[PDB]
Design an enzyme around this catalytic site. Structure first.
Site, PDB file in Angstrom:
ATOM      1  CG  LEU A  20      -1.835  -1.287   1.213  1.00 52.39           C
ATOM      2  CD1 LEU A  20      -2.662  -1.410   2.488  1.00 52.39           C
ATOM      3  CD2 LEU A  20      -2.739  -1.313  -0.029  1.00 52.39           C
ATOM      4  CD  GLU A  39      -9.651   1.557   4.069  1.00 49.88           C
ATOM      5  OE1 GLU A  39     -10.729   1.558   3.416  1.00 49.88           O
ATOM      6  OE2 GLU A  39      -8.723   0.731   3.860  1.00 49.88           O
TER       7      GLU A  39
HETATM    8  N1  LIG Z   1      -5.535   0.290  -2.134  1.00 48.45           N
HETATM    9  C1  LIG Z   1      -6.274  -0.818  -2.309  1.00 48.45           C
HETATM   10  O1  LIG Z   1      -7.657  -0.851  -2.101  1.00 48.45           O
HETATM   11  C2  LIG Z   1      -5.620  -2.089  -2.745  1.00 48.45           C
HETATM   12  C3  LIG Z   1      -4.301  -2.033  -3.150  1.00 48.45           C
HETATM   13  N2  LIG Z   1      -3.755  -3.059  -3.862  1.00 48.45           N
HETATM   14  C4  LIG Z   1      -2.344  -2.924  -4.280  1.00 48.45           C
HETATM   15  O2  LIG Z   1      -2.280  -2.835  -5.697  1.00 48.45           O
HETATM   16  C5  LIG Z   1      -1.151  -3.547  -6.177  1.00 48.45           C
HETATM   17  C6  LIG Z   1      -1.626  -4.769  -6.949  1.00 48.45           C
HETATM   18  O3  LIG Z   1      -2.552  -4.398  -7.947  1.00 48.45           O
HETATM   19  P1  LIG Z   1      -2.127  -4.446  -9.498  1.00 48.45           P
HETATM   20  O4  LIG Z   1      -0.687  -4.094  -9.560  1.00 48.45           O
HETATM   21  O5  LIG Z   1      -3.109  -3.646 -10.264  1.00 48.45           O
HETATM   22  O6  LIG Z   1      -2.234  -6.010  -9.905  1.00 48.45           O
HETATM   23  P2  LIG Z   1      -3.367  -7.159  -9.928  1.00 48.45           P
HETATM   24  O7  LIG Z   1      -3.747  -7.667  -8.591  1.00 48.45           O
HETATM   25  O8  LIG Z   1      -4.531  -6.723 -10.729  1.00 48.45           O
HETATM   26  O9  LIG Z   1      -2.588  -8.334 -10.704  1.00 48.45           O
HETATM   27  C7  LIG Z   1      -2.283  -8.175 -12.071  1.00 48.45           C
HETATM   28  C8  LIG Z   1      -2.310  -9.574 -12.662  1.00 48.45           C
HETATM   29  O10 LIG Z   1      -3.536 -10.168 -12.286  1.00 48.45           O
HETATM   30  C9  LIG Z   1      -4.137 -10.824 -13.383  1.00 48.45           C
HETATM   31  N3  LIG Z   1      -5.316 -10.054 -13.841  1.00 48.45           N
HETATM   32  C10 LIG Z   1      -5.578  -8.731 -13.573  1.00 48.45           C
HETATM   33  N4  LIG Z   1      -6.752  -8.392 -14.154  1.00 48.45           N
HETATM   34  C11 LIG Z   1      -7.256  -9.474 -14.786  1.00 48.45           C
HETATM   35  C12 LIG Z   1      -8.420  -9.665 -15.526  1.00 48.45           C
HETATM   36  N5  LIG Z   1      -9.283  -8.662 -15.709  1.00 48.45           N
HETATM   37  N6  LIG Z   1      -8.673 -10.910 -16.068  1.00 48.45           N
HETATM   38  C13 LIG Z   1      -7.779 -11.944 -15.870  1.00 48.45           C
HETATM   39  N7  LIG Z   1      -6.627 -11.747 -15.135  1.00 48.45           N
HETATM   40  C14 LIG Z   1      -6.365 -10.528 -14.600  1.00 48.45           C
HETATM   41  C15 LIG Z   1      -3.068 -10.872 -14.449  1.00 48.45           C
HETATM   42  O11 LIG Z   1      -2.252 -11.966 -14.104  1.00 48.45           O
HETATM   43  P3  LIG Z   1      -1.477 -12.832 -15.213  1.00 48.45           P
HETATM   44  O12 LIG Z   1      -0.308 -12.020 -15.722  1.00 48.45           O
HETATM   45  O13 LIG Z   1      -0.964 -14.084 -14.549  1.00 48.45           O
HETATM   46  O14 LIG Z   1      -2.447 -13.174 -16.320  1.00 48.45           O
HETATM   47  C16 LIG Z   1      -2.269  -9.618 -14.179  1.00 48.45           C
HETATM   48  O15 LIG Z   1      -0.942  -9.748 -14.630  1.00 48.45           O
HETATM   49  C17 LIG Z   1      -0.377  -3.988  -4.951  1.00 48.45           C
HETATM   50  O16 LIG Z   1       0.550  -2.969  -4.657  1.00 48.45           O
HETATM   51  C18 LIG Z   1      -1.439  -4.077  -3.878  1.00 48.45           C
HETATM   52  O17 LIG Z   1      -0.905  -3.883  -2.586  1.00 48.45           O
HETATM   53  C19 LIG Z   1      -4.511  -4.147  -4.205  1.00 48.45           C
HETATM   54  C20 LIG Z   1      -5.846  -4.230  -3.812  1.00 48.45           C
HETATM   55  C21 LIG Z   1      -6.406  -3.196  -3.068  1.00 48.45           C
HETATM   56  C1  LIG Z   2      -7.535  -2.421   3.860  1.00 49.88           C
HETATM   57  C2  LIG Z   2      -7.083  -2.387   2.414  1.00 49.88           C
HETATM   58  C3  LIG Z   2      -8.186  -2.159   1.589  1.00 49.88           C
HETATM   59  N1  LIG Z   2      -9.069  -1.177   1.844  1.00 49.88           N
HETATM   60  C4  LIG Z   2     -10.128  -0.965   1.029  1.00 49.88           C
HETATM   61  N2  LIG Z   2     -11.013   0.003   1.283  1.00 49.88           N
HETATM   62  N3  LIG Z   2     -10.321  -1.727  -0.056  1.00 49.88           N
HETATM   63  C5  LIG Z   2      -9.467  -2.715  -0.343  1.00 49.88           C
HETATM   64  N4  LIG Z   2      -9.607  -3.500  -1.408  1.00 49.88           N
HETATM   65  C6  LIG Z   2      -8.370  -2.960   0.471  1.00 49.88           C
HETATM   66  C7  LIG Z   2      -7.465  -4.026   0.153  1.00 49.88           C
HETATM   67  C8  LIG Z   2      -6.745  -4.885  -0.123  1.00 49.88           C
HETATM   68  C9  LIG Z   2      -5.821  -5.997  -0.479  1.00 49.88           C
HETATM   69  C10 LIG Z   2      -6.633  -7.277  -0.724  1.00 49.88           C
HETATM   70  C11 LIG Z   2      -4.878  -6.183   0.553  1.00 49.88           C
HETATM   71  C12 LIG Z   2      -3.610  -5.650   0.378  1.00 49.88           C
HETATM   72  C13 LIG Z   2      -2.637  -5.789   1.353  1.00 49.88           C
HETATM   73  O1  LIG Z   2      -1.417  -5.228   1.096  1.00 49.88           O
HETATM   74  C14 LIG Z   2      -0.452  -5.401   2.134  1.00 49.88           C
HETATM   75  C15 LIG Z   2      -2.927  -6.476   2.534  1.00 49.88           C
HETATM   76  C16 LIG Z   2      -4.201  -7.012   2.730  1.00 49.88           C
HETATM   77  C17 LIG Z   2      -4.472  -7.724   3.903  1.00 49.88           C
HETATM   78  C18 LIG Z   2      -3.495  -7.827   4.893  1.00 49.88           C
HETATM   79  C19 LIG Z   2      -3.734  -8.532   6.070  1.00 49.88           C
HETATM   80  N5  LIG Z   2      -4.972  -9.152   6.267  1.00 49.88           N
HETATM   81  C20 LIG Z   2      -5.953  -9.058   5.273  1.00 49.88           C
HETATM   82  C21 LIG Z   2      -5.705  -8.340   4.104  1.00 49.88           C
HETATM   83  C22 LIG Z   2      -5.170  -6.874   1.729  1.00 49.88           C
END
Ligand SMILES: NC(=O)C1=CN([C@@H]2O[C@H](COP(=O)(O)OP(=O)(O)OC[C@H]3O[C@@H](n4cnc5c(N)ncnc54)[C@H](OP(=O)(O)O)[C@@H]3O)[C@@H](O)[C@H]2O)C=CC1
Ligand SMILES: CCc1nc(N)nc(N)c1C#C[C@H](C)c1cc(OC)cc(-c2ccncc2)c1
Ligand SMILES: [Ca+2]
Length: 186
Positions: A22, A30
């Site tokens: 993150l 959150e």
């Molecule tokens: N702030 C937040 O709410 C959250 C933050 N994050 C953060 O975001 C980052 C990760 O997200 P991001 O980098 O976008 O990567 P993703 O989690 O989306 O992973 C990308 C890979 O996932 C697969 N993929 C993604 N979209 C599709 C689709 N539509 N259909 C089929 N396969 C798919 C593909 O894998 P393949 O190459 O194998 O085909 C692609 O290479 C991390 O830093 C994480 O911590 C993640 C979730 C929530």
């Molecule tokens: C709150 C973060 C968060 N907030 C909101 N509003 N939406 C989301 N989708 C996520 C999210 C997310 C991804 C799945 C995520 C990233 C991560 O990056 C370190 C740690 C966790 C995670 C570590 C420990 N236990 C459960 C989940 C989840």
């Protein structure tokens, strides 16, 4: 499945990730919100399904994988079986939603939650039908390498308040944020 939900936390500059983590320091409440929304099932005896991209899966600390109390599904075109600890694998969102109809998942899934990352949100936000986007607006800039797609206000409406969601600005560790809910019906 007749409704999808997306949940994301996003900085002012639209960042959601940085170096596989993150962009901001951990925000406990959150996180608890994320847990509450994604885990709470309205049907006794069913769990919610969480759908996530491959990098998102590996961004979760191994010890917390799979996300407890939820059915974890990972999207990947490259993988041939689910990552160790994941319950299911699909090549597309469409394929994921179809799998919920099959015998194994029949009557085990309540709500479906898309939990990241960028390309998963992009596909989900354009999926037909009712969709809710739960967006936490982190009200400052953080250095990021992954971003949240812009919300099309032609399709989505910001709901002024929403049952079960706090409306006022929140603060943890000096970082202000607020919970938003968007909705499209078609
Ligand atoms: N702030 C937040 O709410 C959250 C933050 N994050 C953060 O975001 C980052 C990760 O997200 P991001 O980098 O976008 O990567 P993703 O989690 O989306 O992973 C990308 C890979 O996932 C697969 N993929 C993604 N979209 C599709 C689709 N539509 N259909 C089929 N396969 C798919 C593909 O894998 P393949 O190459 O194998 O085909 C692609 O290479 C991390 O830093 C994480 O911590 C993640 C979730 C929530
Ligand atoms: C709150 C973060 C968060 N907030 C909101 N509003 N939406 C989301 N989708 C996520 C999210 C997310 C991804 C799945 C995520 C990233 C991560 O990056 C370190 C740690 C966790 C995670 C570590 C420990 N236990 C459960 C989940 C989840
Ligand atoms: Ca819903």
């Amino acid at each position: 499945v007749g409704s999808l939900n997306c949940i994301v936390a996003v900085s002012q500059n639209m960042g959601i990730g940085k170096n596989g983590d993150l962009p901001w320091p951990p925000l406990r409440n959150e996180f608890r919100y994320f847990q509450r929304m994604t885990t709470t099932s309205s049907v006794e005896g069913k769990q919610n399904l969480v759908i996530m991209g491959k990098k998102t899966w590996f961004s979760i600390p191994e010890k917390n994988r799979p996300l407890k109390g939820r059915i974890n599904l990972v999207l990947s075109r490259e993988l041939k079986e689910p990552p160790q600890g994941a319950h299911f694998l699909s090549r597309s969102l469409d394929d994921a939603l179809k799998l919920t109809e099959q015998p194994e998942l029949a009557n085990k899934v309540d709500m479906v939650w898309i939990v990241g990352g960028s390309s998963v949100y992009k596909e989900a936000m354009n999926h037909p039908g009712h969709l809710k986007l739960f967006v936490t607006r982190i009200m400052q800039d953080f250095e990021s390498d992954t971003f949240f797609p812009e919300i099309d206000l032609e399709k989505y409406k910001l709901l002024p308040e929403y049952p079960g969601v706090l409306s006022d600005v929140q603060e943890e560790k000096g970082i202000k944020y607020k919970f938003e809910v968007y909705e499209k019906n078609d």
